[PDB]
Amino acid sequence: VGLQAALWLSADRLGDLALLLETLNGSQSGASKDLLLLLKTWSPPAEELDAPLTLQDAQGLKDVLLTAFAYRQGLQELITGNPDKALSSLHEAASGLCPRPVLVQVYTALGSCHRKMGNPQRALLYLVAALKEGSAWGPPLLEASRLYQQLGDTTAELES
Amino acid sequence: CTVLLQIMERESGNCPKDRYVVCGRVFLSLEDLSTGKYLLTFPKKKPIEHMEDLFALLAAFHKSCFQITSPGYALNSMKVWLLEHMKCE
């Protein structure tokens, strides 16, 4: 089911996905139309008893799904232009299985969220953190450019 | 027994200030232990509500300290390991 749902989440079938998971947990969780709550509620069943081996387990996939879905949702909420609903899910992304490029992109993404809210000093904080932790530091320099443009500090924008 | 807290200062190379202090005096007997009263005995005696009992296990038990460094992920698994796999209160 995890892999299946991974295919659908790679292919953007979120309407069918949440319904599948509604079926998976008790359908009393029917009005819980949110995905990410539903992914957390999803509880793979066993401690995986002495069975044939496998390259990956149900738990390591729930741990991959929570971070993938929360990242993708945070970028959709950003681009659609609601950078207050973002912060919650873009923090729930780092609070999980978050590889070091996924972390770099969450930090840039929160720089963007803060720039849009008009909080340049916080956005500078997250962008310096993204520079530090990352080895892929293009997008951070871009977000700094866009933030100094939004402000006016044009020599800084140009240096970025 | 009698309990003696000894103290030695380090900065002053005069060896000056050894404020001994005799802090109480401890009696035990087998008649006491036979009625418990001082023992720490495992399970069911879970809900530790005299904090001395907790400081006893941090004193009696063997201690080892590990640094964990993930160079390529983040580290939020620890509380889960601790709370779900180890079922910690």
Curated annotation (Swiss-Prot), chain A:
Q: Tissue-wise, where is it found?
A: Highly expressed in testis and thymus. Found in lymphoblasts.
So which domain of life are we looking at? Eukaryota
* TPR repeat start-end pairs: 104-137
What does the UniProt entry say about where the protein is found?
Nucleus; Cytoplasm
What role is this protein assigned? DNA repair protein that may operate in a postreplication repair or a cell cycle checkpoint function. May be implicated in interstrand DNA cross-link repair and in the maintenance of normal chromosome stability. Candidate tumor suppressor gene.
Q: How does it assemble?
A: Belongs to the multisubunit FA complex composed of FANCA, FANCB, FANCC, FANCE, FANCF, FANCG, FANCL/PHF9 and FANCM. The complex is not found in FA patients. In complex with FANCF, FANCA and FANCL, but not with FANCC, nor FANCE, interacts with HES1; this interaction may be essential for the stability and nuclear localization of FA core complex proteins. The complex with FANCC and FANCG may also include EIF2AK2 and HSP70.
Q: Which disease is it linked to?
A: Fanconi anemia complementation group G: A disorder affecting all bone marrow elements and resulting in anemia, leukopenia and thrombopenia. It is associated with cardiac, renal and limb malformations, dermal pigmentary changes, and a predisposition to the development of malignancies. At the cellular level it is associated with hypersensitivity to DNA-damaging agents, chromosomal instability (increased chromosome breakage) and defective DNA repair.
What protein name does the entry list?
Answer: Fanconi anemia group G protein
Q: Which organism is it from?
A: Homo sapiens
Q: Which gene encodes it?
A: FANCG
Curated annotation (Swiss-Prot), chain B:
According to the UniProt entry, the coiled-coil residues are none
**Cell location:** Nucleus
Q: What does this protein do?
A: DNA repair protein required for FANCD2 ubiquitination.
Q: What illness does the record link it to?
A: Fanconi anemia complementation group B: A disorder affecting all bone marrow elements and resulting in anemia, leukopenia and thrombopenia. It is associated with cardiac, renal and limb malformations, dermal pigmentary changes, and a predisposition to the development of malignancies. At the cellular level it is associated with hypersensitivity to DNA-damaging agents, chromosomal instability (increased chromosome breakage) and defective DNA repair. Some severe FANCB cases manifest features of VACTERL syndrome with hydrocephalus.
How is the quaternary structure described?
A: Belongs to the multisubunit FA complex composed of FANCA, FANCB, FANCC, FANCE, FANCF, FANCG, FANCL/PHF9 and FANCM. The complex is not found in FA patients.
Q: Could you tell me what this protein is called?
A: Fanconi anemia group B protein
Taxonomy-wise, where does this protein's organism fall, top ranks first? Answer: Eukaryota, Metazoa, Chordata, Craniata, Vertebrata
The primary gene name is FANCB
